[PDB]
Amino acid sequence: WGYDDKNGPEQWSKLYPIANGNNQSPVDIKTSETKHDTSLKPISVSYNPATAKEIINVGHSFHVNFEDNDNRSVLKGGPFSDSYRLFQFHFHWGSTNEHGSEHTVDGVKYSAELHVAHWNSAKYSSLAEAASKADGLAVIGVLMKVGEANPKLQKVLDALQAIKTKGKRAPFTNFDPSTLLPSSLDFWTYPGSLTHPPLYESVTWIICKESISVSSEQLAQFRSLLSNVEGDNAVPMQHNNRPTQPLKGRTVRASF
Ligand SMILES: [Zn+2]
């Protein structure tokens, strides 16, 4: 699977039938059709820079993984009574600045998206087990709006030199991803999926109302990453965003 016509999102049906499911992500969020839920509590994050572990080029993207052996880095509140354990952050971007985000808001496409991923350690004993469970994952999505350079991205982009080609990995240490989060943690939530294969319908999405900035050149740094192995002809990662999928009668709640 990948993001080419050959093997891209419209092809994923073939090998992952769940692509045509009822809880697929991303979605377009229409703000006149969201329902304010008064039961939603604040989103609370408490992440430990010491849990930051590694950065990895996964061919279609790059992942920043976290030590998930204990509860030093957790998401709670919002729709949850279970505390959720940090394990990863990563981005999606598009071939152009116009569209790069996965989620859209009133049809507005953004330039890229940050996903910050957690698994349910209150109910399961590993990410592998939580991954396929309806209440397994909790993922904060942050829309990324082209404009001013985001210095908070610095360590991340600075790191990509060491993982230029597919399969390269590097230590990535002493980092707290909550520094990448917007000031206001007002959010929408809906039940959704992973946005690429295996595409499990295990994600409660937390989509931030407030975006964060990214410069056009910072984006070009993402696209500089190579999808090929060291030594092969260069194939840069031009894009890795899925089109938005039908809501199928789901409701997106607003905290605000
Ligand atoms: Zn993602």
Number of helices: 3
CATH architecture, by name, is: Roll
| Biggest sheet statistics | 13 strands, mixed
| Name of the top-level CATH class | Alpha Beta
Q: Helix-strand pattern, N to C? A: EEEEEEEEEHEHEEEEHE
Binned strand content: 25-35%
PDB class: lyase
Keywords: carbonic anhydrase, antiviral, crystal stucture, lyase
Assembly: monomeric
Entry title: X ray structure of the complex between Carbonic Anhydrase I and the phosphonate antiviral drug foscarnet
Notes on the structure:
- This protein has 256 residues and is mostly beta strands.
- Helices cover 7% and strands 29% of the residues.
- β4 (52-57) and β5 (62-66) form a beta hairpin.
- The longest helix is centred in the C-terminal third of the chain and has 9 residues, at 216-224.
- The radius of gyration is 17 Å and the shape is globular.
- The protein binds zinc ion.
- Zinc ion (ZN) is lined by residues 90, 92, 115, 195.
- The PDB classes it as lyase.
- The entry lists the keywords carbonic anhydrase, antiviral, crystal stucture, lyase.
